[PDB]
Subunit: 292 residues, 4 copies
């Protein structure tokens, strides 16, 4: 499949006790495919609360997402972990499920050297035989990969490019300049327009599973050169995103899904599991102003 | 005058002993006006080696720049300093010289509170009666001003906006959204295109006093919606800028001015005063590839 | 048991394939008890490569260490995780093994609020009924808990104090002023003397695996006010630690164990699994100079 | 003179208009010598609000302090600046006054290379013929010099050691190991005990202006190995310092001086020039609790 364009970073529905709610998770997937009209899903990312889950849970989410989506859309499986043996086990499972590409966060917590980082990517690829997308998220991992280092990663022909949840647009431009055949997916939804202006190939975003219509319009208008209109739509989206961030990101996207009848459920502990009354009321105001 | 568009951050020619070379400084000003075709000059900024100079030297530079440029172009005088009494003295002098606006760096070194910062801006404005442009450069000062704080600064009607040498494009978009009548000048030349895509009103840049032709083309093509062409010109400019940064920023821009017959002189100690042979040869290669 | 004094952060022996080497792990435990004469072991900390391992592997390590040590020394089980359900499962298992206290890293990766972090500690305690030591390691997690926040955690009376792998000695002194009955274990071996001078109750350290004799001397001499002699031993200790850090921290402590007959094995991928030959020779030099 | 021991970082008395109050500055100097019984004064440091002042004002302060103190105590002149020609002019003037050593902050604001920083120290020394103390204050300048780099500075035999306003006690111990004949003055008053335990040669501190008696006791008791008694005095000291930091550091030390009859005056804009009335009462509480 084509891996360009708009990918929601899939949110997962949890029950009160923190178990996966399969019915809810399917409604989320269905909603992204049918109503947000995404090109694909990025499953197991930070937005899916992935790092708070067990390996078996992560497998269940991969299985459920793929069974619901089938081949209607492109699917990318984020399998990265500080535990390389887990990342390999997950990448094999996702590959056998038919995921179109793997993705892996740079290994974190410990301060890994660049050679260790590369060996981690190469090891997942060798064990799975699947494509790989580097998942770069410096504001969470503390890891900053430079132009020449991405090029060493790109010496492995199964590495397709980078899910770039980073805000350095000089680095962004330089990666496009040096590796014009490798892909970049912008990761910060509130900076989609300036990333689109630099020729990114698509975007992966949490807010796309409620705002995926505007997200597509910004992306398409910008790359068609209609910046005045793309900018307008970016301004309204950033009103919504500022609202969502203030109110509590994952819970608030989930609340916005609930207001459209998607049983998007609780967040997983240790995240706060549920919005207070006041925050529910604020999310309803966001819905009325921006998504109704 | 109109303060929109392309402003070179003026470089200053020094002699071997660190004194200002007036003939050189005039040739720099002349070159920006006549060959780079800038809309204005930003005098006394970080690029002018301002923070390594005495108050009397800074005054001489203001006097010389204004006497050479006259009213051919817009002139902005950066007068900020950890010493508020110096900043007031400089802002008065620049105002009496006819500078179109003042600008001041956020006070630095000490960790000033936001109220102290605002009192500094308001004090300069009250003493001078001139317009003020906030000079925000977090990667040097460590000071990060937020949307609501810019709005408190903008309660003073003589504050025109911000010289934004910062790379947070979410903040950038938010400032345009909240204060659509206040101006923003992008400060990172290697990120001009994505800043132009968000509707900045112009740019202040060191590299414009050798690359001000391409800088204008990126700015105009982007805001006319021709992103494919603006992107191309941004890629070549960033090859040049990457070169310049690797070789030594201020010295290398000065070397590029010398290759066009501008006596751009030495840098001021404690900066390295002169390029080595090897670095001169590299700057000549930059000239041959990008500016000939 | 008395939980004061010298605790080695237990290293784990791995096979070439990343699996646990039980014989090797047992010999490490024995070497600590019998040769390093430690007061206890801190098991499953960052030093034990814990965050690269499966839930089952962590349990296996808890089981082995307890089996070897029996009740000859104190044992603390680090059970913290970004996965709260994992932390609870591990905390219950270590509690059933008869671990003298649990400990848990502040939840990391995601940017959790202080209420969420407190809820995480309280939930582990509620589920296990065991003592809890907060594991604070800001340079790996980016989380910095302040004096008032420690006080809120200390409202739970099963919270004993803090494994303070942190370098702020004003915070350290302030915690002892505020909470004089709560314990502190210093976590930077190379700053043992100044931490001991502030009246910490013990220390938890990776290098105590090989240098536990000097570590006890620094600690005991410092608390007796014999600073001249403590400082001497700290200088030699720090020559060794500087060499260990330059050569590769966990690999080099393992090599130093191997040089004494202990089957300390490989590191676990994605860490580099073995030293280069050059670095093996360097560990031999350290052994000859500092440990023979 | 012997440059070891307890040095207050001299505060400066300002008038309402920001000018120097000579009578007030003289009374501060006298209070230090006569009541705080300091070994010396560190004049023109960050504590003296130096970086907010003109060249002439700095000279006036050097002149006054020397005039009052004569040879009753040691005197060190902080003459560092981003302006090297300024540092040289000040260094020559303080040397002509008979200052026992110069000192200079690492050049800041710009991102200077280590060679440029060394050239700056060497140039000041060459121009003045006086001793030099490196002033290291990473939390204000962002500059962190490492052990090998200190060694390169120490190749100049007029470099005596370092005013270490820094909190890394591994670096501290490593500097004493490597350069045992070079001096270190600890610069964080609230970490005096652990610094003294590592064998620093003295301390330079703003709070010594009002708490010099306890500061000498902590320092002397620590070096005698009377840690229990040193720690007590450090706890009380740190109750006072925590209150001073919460209330506004330089203003509150000035208020505490005023409460003893010393005309310590205002702070200099852009610092807040005087305490709110509420905070004046709070300084009175500190005085009653800690200093009467
Ligand atoms: C950490 C995070 O949530 N990042 C989001 C963003 O879409 C982000 O939520 C949004 O731009 C607001 O910050 C995307 O990059 C997708 C992603 O990294 C993920 O799977 O979490
Ligand atoms: C610190 C600095 O040089 N900034 C330049 C940039 O133009 C910069 O030189 C360029 O983008 C490369 O980093 C501009 O922001 C202008 C400026 O701040 C200045 O006066 O120095
Ligand atoms: C991160 C780490 O390894 N820290 C060690 C230290 O002993 C450290 O290895 C030593 O001070 C060298 O920096 C201890 O704090 C124990 C600990 O946190 C651990 O199990 O990792
Ligand atoms: C930045 C500052 O004020 N530092 C003081 C300290 O004494 C400090 O005020 C005190 O430890 C409270 O943090 C000393 O290091 C002396 C010094 O650097 C100075 O003159 O500012
Ligand atoms: Cl970032
Ligand atoms: Cl390519
Ligand atoms: Cl920035
Ligand atoms: Cl406005
Ligand atoms: Cl207590
Ligand atoms: Cl020495």
């Amino acid at each position: 499949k084509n891996l360009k364009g708009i990918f929601s970073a899939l949110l997962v529905s949890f029950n009160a006790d923190g178990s996966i709610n399969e019915k809810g998770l399917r409604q989320i997937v269905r909603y992204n495919i049918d109503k947000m009209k995404v090109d694909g899903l990025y499953v197991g990312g930070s937005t899916g609360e992935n790092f708070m889950l067990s390996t078996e849970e992560k497998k269940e989410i991969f299985r459920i997402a793929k069974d619901e989506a089938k081949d209607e859309i492109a699917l990318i499986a984020q399998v990265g972990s500080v535990n390389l043996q887990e990342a390999i086990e997950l990448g094999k499972y996702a590959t056998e499920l038919g995921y179109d590409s793997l993705s892996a966060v740079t290994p974190f917590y410990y301060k890994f050297s660049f050679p260790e980082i590369k060996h981690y990517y190469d090891s997942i690829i060798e064990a799975t035989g699947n494509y790989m997308i580097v998942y770069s998220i410096p504001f969470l991992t503390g890891v900053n990969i430079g132009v020449e280092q991405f090029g060493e990663l790109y010496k492995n022909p199964k590495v397709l490019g980078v899910a770039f949840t980073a805000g350095d647009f000089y680095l962004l431009e330089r990666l496009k300049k040096a590796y014009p055949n490798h892909l970049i997916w912008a990761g910060f939804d509130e900076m989609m327009l300036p990333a689109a202006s630099l020729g990114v190939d698509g975007a992966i975003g949490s807010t796309f599973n409620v705002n995926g219509v505007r997200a597509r319009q910004i992306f398409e208008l910008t790359q068609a050169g209609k910046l005045k209109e793309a900018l307008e739509i970016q301004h309204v989206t950033n009103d919504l995103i500022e609202g969502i961030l203030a109110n509590g990101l994952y819970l608030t996207i989930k609340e916005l899904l609930k207001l459209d009848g998607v049983e998007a459920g609780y967040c997983r502990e240790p995240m706060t599991k549920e919005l207070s009354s006041e925050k529910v009321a604020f999310a309803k105001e966001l819905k009325a102003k921006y998504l109704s």
